[PDB]
Design a protein around this nucleic acid. Sequence first.
RNA 1: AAGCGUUUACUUUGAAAAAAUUAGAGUGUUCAAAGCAGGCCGCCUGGAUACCGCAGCUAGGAAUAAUGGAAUAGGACCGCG
RNA 2: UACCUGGUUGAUCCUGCCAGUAGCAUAUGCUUGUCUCAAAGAUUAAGCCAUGCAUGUCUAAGUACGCACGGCCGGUACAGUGAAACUGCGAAUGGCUCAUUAAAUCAGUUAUGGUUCCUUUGGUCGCUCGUACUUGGAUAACUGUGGUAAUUCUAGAGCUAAUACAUGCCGACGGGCGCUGACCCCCUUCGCGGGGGGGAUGCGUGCAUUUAUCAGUGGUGACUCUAGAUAACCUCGGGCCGAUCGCACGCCCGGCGGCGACGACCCAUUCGAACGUCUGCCCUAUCAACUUUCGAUGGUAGUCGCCGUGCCUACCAUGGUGACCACGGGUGACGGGGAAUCAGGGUUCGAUUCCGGAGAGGGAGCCUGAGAAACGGCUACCACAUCCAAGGAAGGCAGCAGGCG
Lengths: 143, 177, 206, 262
Amino acid sequence: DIQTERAYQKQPTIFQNKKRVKLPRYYKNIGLGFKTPKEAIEGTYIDKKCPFTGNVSIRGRILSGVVTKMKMQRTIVIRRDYLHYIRKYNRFEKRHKNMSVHLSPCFRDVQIGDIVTVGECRPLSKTVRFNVLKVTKAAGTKK
Amino acid sequence: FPMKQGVLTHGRVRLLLSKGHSCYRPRRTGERKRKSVRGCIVDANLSVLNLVIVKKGEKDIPGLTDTTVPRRLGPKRASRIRKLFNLSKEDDVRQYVVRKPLNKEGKKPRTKAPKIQRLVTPRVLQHKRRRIALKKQRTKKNKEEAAEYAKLLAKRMKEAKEKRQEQIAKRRRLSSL
Amino acid sequence: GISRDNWHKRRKTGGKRKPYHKKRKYELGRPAANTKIGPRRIHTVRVRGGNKKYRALRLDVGNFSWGSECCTRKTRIIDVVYNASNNELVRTKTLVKNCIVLIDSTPYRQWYESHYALPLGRKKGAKLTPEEEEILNKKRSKKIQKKYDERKKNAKISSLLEEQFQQGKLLACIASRPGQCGRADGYVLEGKELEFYLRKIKARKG
Amino acid sequence: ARGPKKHLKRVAAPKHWMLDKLTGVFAPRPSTGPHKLRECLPLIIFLRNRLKYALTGDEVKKICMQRFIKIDGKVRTDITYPAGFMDVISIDKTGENFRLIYDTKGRFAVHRITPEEAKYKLCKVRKIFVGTKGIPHLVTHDARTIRYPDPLIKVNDTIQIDLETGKITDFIKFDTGNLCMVTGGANLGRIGVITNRERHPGSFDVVHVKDANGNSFATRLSNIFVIGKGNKPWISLPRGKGIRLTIAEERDKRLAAKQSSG
RNA sequence: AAGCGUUUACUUUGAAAAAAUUAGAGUGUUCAAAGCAGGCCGCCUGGAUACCGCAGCUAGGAAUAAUGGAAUAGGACCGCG
RNA sequence: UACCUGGUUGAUCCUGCCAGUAGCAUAUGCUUGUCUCAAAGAUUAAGCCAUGCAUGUCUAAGUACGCACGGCCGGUACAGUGAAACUGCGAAUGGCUCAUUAAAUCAGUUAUGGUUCCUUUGGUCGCUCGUACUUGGAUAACUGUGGUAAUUCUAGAGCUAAUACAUGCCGACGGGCGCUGACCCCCUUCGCGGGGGGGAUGCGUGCAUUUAUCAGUGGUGACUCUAGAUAACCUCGGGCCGAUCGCACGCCCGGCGGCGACGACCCAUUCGAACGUCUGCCCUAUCAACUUUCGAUGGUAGUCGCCGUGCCUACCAUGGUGACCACGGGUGACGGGGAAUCAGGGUUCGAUUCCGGAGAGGGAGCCUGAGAAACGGCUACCACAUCCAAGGAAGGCAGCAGGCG
């Protein structure tokens, strides 16, 4: 079922080994007026790199992006189309800085084309410094 | 090339040294430098041998047994004066100082005495009573500083309880509206 | 030795960076501890900022927390059973963080028949002839019999723990880092956490 | 550079000292202390460049050895002491007490105060930390960690202290409708009243400051010092009184003094 | 008075954008370049101001450039067992 | 200041470049009276350096038995300078240059809620429960032996001091409190039983750290924040509780007090440093597919680190990027603020006095020191290179001047 990794998988805050006679879970609000999702509380998973149920806090900047790849485990790759004006030739240039953000399995139905706001945090790997905060649905296509 | 301690060689080796070890003076603080030293063993490839006579012989050499070199510097710490002169804690050390006669041509015969270190002095007793006074003064200062804060803490905990007593009075008015 | 620098390797694409400076003193990496079990021996190292760290080479001290009653003793360490990091450290006796090891139970046993005075384990046929701990179980007054009766009803032990105490050996986890501070503290395995690793030892042994 | 800076170029220092290029390449680097690097004032500039007491910098070295300059009760022997906002450099025997307040411009001004004013300060607390024994600590902008406070002082508040005991005396709280002055930047020297406080999530907070003549302008929360309760300051004001009138009106008052005197 | 808004590109304001250098108030170093003075029987004063590109924060507008709401109806709203 | 003329033809109008036109930097040639500022080895050689010099420093507040001086009032040690030496801080600052470097440096907004911090400032510094009227023994200077061809080379014998080095307490200190808790007192029940108080003995009871839980004084936009207690840990290659010194000087009948310096256990300040986010860089398709068990892309668990991280290690997935130009190559590319020419739009330069990065011939490694992978600091090798008695020693001017190419 769960805890298929090498060591024991649990939240560092919780403790269930006290003398008995559902498992307790610890979470946190994120700030800047973003809600806490329902399944991060309801679920039984753990993730130390999640800004809701892990030892990481969002600080600095908060930006957005659109998902283009998901072929990794527990993280995705986003696309960031931004426009830059050139002073000499008075026209715009199409540039993007695609980079990976850590998608926790707190969200389940994540598809292509979804706009996802993202928050700066401490570096958790070589190049990722971001985590998925909340996921908005795509333009239509409910089915 | 001077010889070394414990190198256990016989020829000529270059060895790095450090502070706290002999045969190398640290010019910069903690600098490492190799130095050509000789082995700890003695052989015929030597120029000067340094010998220390521990057991005196039966016959009399006129070089060291005849002429006894007087002491250059006596003890300076008052405890070594107590060790040398067999002094207790109560007897005075100032009268038992080791002075030296000083005389030369053109000047009067003088005498000089060392400045005794770690001697019982009412100056350091003034320092000893001062550092325990600051222990007294800081104990008294923070005790009253906490006492005035406790009354200041007792100053809010009555208005804050009354502030909630006025607020719990306020919820009763809205319940009867 | 080893250098702790991000710029010595490739980009996210695959290109190789061109460094602009030599390895610095704040890019320092020293050889690993790789401690063993024996007499106590701490080696000190000077670190960045004028502080100190304590490197363990052979260590026997360890203060391990019993979770259900929150009491810990500095109990001897004897061996290594399983480590979640490397299978070589399973066989080579080393203690790093998060090591599942076998420890003696007796310092926690002494507290149990002293504060609570209830027999746990203690297979019949053998009795303590020095009679030191029967004093710890007998000679009760009137109003302390009420207190020890209260402890009797509030000491329902788990069935998994008693089997582990029957052999005298307990399982412990290394929460602290002996490489940094020289201490190999942790907490004793209990309940579901202990139950997971008894399946894991058989999964590797066969 | 294998360590921190110790020297200071004459030109590399920011504008608010009005240092001059023709004298020397270097400048007196402020040492380590309770105030900033670009918001302080070393004592050598305070006496040589402003007060016209000396001609060379070596005279300032002699003065501190002659037990004359005392700072808030403690005689500092370092002529490069970083002295920021509201420090009394108090002359002993002539009695001229000086208080470092910003001028209407970005500079400092020579300001004579009476000894009754110099016995105390107003200080602005920065943070509250619970001490190791549950002791609330107040840390000022010049880092005066005074324990056992009146807790009604909050994060963005100010404290009135005494200097012969090192303890606080009174406080002024951050209420909407209080006086204000910008401590740093292009609007350095703007004395006005607070008209509205706005809190913005995540980023820095902004407080609108209203001039007595009606000139309302915005100031960020870290760039604010309150000087008094309502419209009654607890400190003194230099000439100009922190108005920052337009540059066209400066020349109109400049020629008023010239033609009247000749 | 405190909080919320289908997203941007746009436009405007505000802090910030390190000095000297860009323009530029004052001043007979005999003009002048430069420089931060000087004048009166201790004072008056100054050493301003303007720009600070791009990206980011902030606050008013949705005209214009897009985006789609719901159509096998699991579409909105007040509600019940 | 939004400008031009001549040149193809027997003779015109156009395209078009060239030639003239004016500043902007460098050199050369001629010539030069005054006077105020004044660039100035980088272009090719970040090539090499003879010579001399750039970090040493003593106050009353660390050591003075050097008459080298010096007071005569001595026997109660040192009047006071005081060479030199032991001991702390700095020498990681500064000056020079741009070799190297193309999202890398660097420039603007940001965060350490993911760490340190020498010195300075604001505070705790009798909070701990177990010879102090001051512990111990080693040394430099000095006396004496010199060894060597040569050095800022070094030892043997006699010592002596520590704010160098180890050990460690008088006072606080008599009790407040949690446990083991013997035992005692009171009420009720026929009684067992139930309930409420007192308490012997010992252990533990500061700060800082390590493991673990309970409840939730004070704040942040959010803590696994700070803080309280419970149960233990305190590294012998240790953490503080002044085993330091100097200047006036007082109160009681031996006991009490002052002004400091210095260094300290810890929390804040400052100068910072490093890790992070977004945005911005010259040319190249005669570079189209690049990278990946020789971490390339994420996860789990560990090691190091000042901490977060494939920074590194074993196992899981083969991914990550590119035609929105990836990878690769070149760059007479350190970057920026900026400078020149200009209607405007730009172009070119920017090593050069300011900021940030790098470095001292080249990489590799390192002690001390808070701070260096330093180089007017070391350890090796390579290229160069000094003395030599042939045994060996000794060096880094892309610093100041200056010398050669």
